[PDB]
Ligand binder design. Structure first.
Ligand SMILES: Cc1cc(/N=N/c2ccc(S(=O)(=O)Nc3ccccn3)cc2)c(N)cc1O
Length: 123
């Protein structure tokens, strides 16, 4: 496995916004507690899971464990950066896996919920 994505940025300034607070306390928390969250709570462990070619296929890995730590560490300056990371996580699943796969159905359920929660992101 590669190192996990960075979760801190020392050369960056930090802020908190209402949108960032919402992304952590509402969006991330709600997805985290979904019945299908567990495969998405940490980086894909291709060695342990014996996933052929995962990191040959997926060059931009992302997961909710990483997103959570980024939020907790005020890694994101712009809310969009966080939204993009969720989207990368879902897209990776669709790149690597096939229609009907259990992991795809799980991703789909999480994405649906994500969209519901981002729809209610405060202005
Ligand atoms: C994001 C992602 C995760 C995957 N698999 N994740 C797993 C996590 C845990 C297990 S397990 O073997 O540790 N636990 C299981 C496996 C099956 C049934 C119940 N528990 C298996 C796959 C997978 N493939 C493809 C993907 O694109």
């Amino acid at each position: 496995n590669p190192p996990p994505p960075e979760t801190s940025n020392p050369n960056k300034p930090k802020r908190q916004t209402n949108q960032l607070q919402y992304l952590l306390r509402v969006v991330l928390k709600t997805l985290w507690k979904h019945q299908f969250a567990w495969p998405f709570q940490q980086p894909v462990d291709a060695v342990k899971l014996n996933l052929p070619d995962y990191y040959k296929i997926i060059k931009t890995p992302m997961d909710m464990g990483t997103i959570k730590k980024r939020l907790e560490n005020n890694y994101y300056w712009n809310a969009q950066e966080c939204i993009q990371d969720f989207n990368t996580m879902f897209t990776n699943c669709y790149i690597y896996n096939k229609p009907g796969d259990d992991i795809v159905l799980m991703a789909e359920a999480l994405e649906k919920l994500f969209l519901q929660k981002i729809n209610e992101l405060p202005t």
